Design a protein around this ligand. Sequence first.
Ligand SMILES: *[C@@H](C(=O)N[C@H](C(=O)N1CCC[C@H]1C(=O)O)[C@@H](C)CC)[C@H](O)C(=O)NCCC
Ligand SMILES: [Mg+2]
Length: 258
Amino acid sequence: SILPKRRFTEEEARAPLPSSFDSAEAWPNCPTIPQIADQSACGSCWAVAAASAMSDRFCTMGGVQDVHISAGDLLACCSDCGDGCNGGDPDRAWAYFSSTGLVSDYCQPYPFPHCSHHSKSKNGYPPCSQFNFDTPKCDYTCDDPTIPVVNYRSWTSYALQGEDDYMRELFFRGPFEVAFDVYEDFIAYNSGVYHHVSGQYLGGHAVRLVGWGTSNGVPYWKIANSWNTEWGMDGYFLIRRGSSECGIEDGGSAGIPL
Ligand SMILES: *[C@@H](C(=O)N[C@H](C(=O)N1CCC[C@H]1C(=O)O)[C@@H](C)CC)[C@H](O)C(=O)NCCC
Ligand SMILES: [Mg+2]
């Protein structure tokens, strides 16, 4: 990783982590945590999962209860993180938050509308397959220019790897970004603990880790996807935990809001 690897203190290391955990239950006064994102018809998962977690950490660590960090700013402005709507790099996203900073979604609201991701929408959202969205130009003022820019930064960023690092980081500091290999069987997930069994490789996908538990003897992670609440289990999926299912334990990205 381009990031330094997380080191836990002796006290953090010996915490006896519970058999289940849910970020929204751990920090009930942090309203961003249960909010599910919609990346729209743009391959910006890397920036949306990052911004969502950054928002959550503003509340779990940074003393700010309800600031939504702008995924739009990240995806348009961190040209070196990757290629905007054509995908990008979670670790570089967190580094940018530390080196450069991000405005809120009040300053720069997400530029792309709700759409239905691999299903028919009860809300009446058009299918994402109908939209042709390029990366927007980076803007350095608010969309409404009478709103003053407030640039938010982290003071440090770091990488996590493996089941214990993930559980322990989540327990102490709250949601963070992870990535995994998407196969076609993931797309129609609705319930259960996901495990890859069929379907072709479709690409890498970055998502926000929020909890863990065990369901009928099967350990899992609880993950917030970015495909709105109509996908999966109210916008979430559970996925197997412990043997890096689809690579999901191979690398997490995090940091600490100032
Ligand atoms: C991650 C990403 O955005 N992935 C895509 C995605 O979720 N999309 C594309 C169109 C809307 C939405 C959808 O499928 O409903 C897609 C390739 C998943 C099948 C992005 O590609 C990226 O940055 N990946 C690298 C992460 C390390
Ligand atoms: Mg001690």
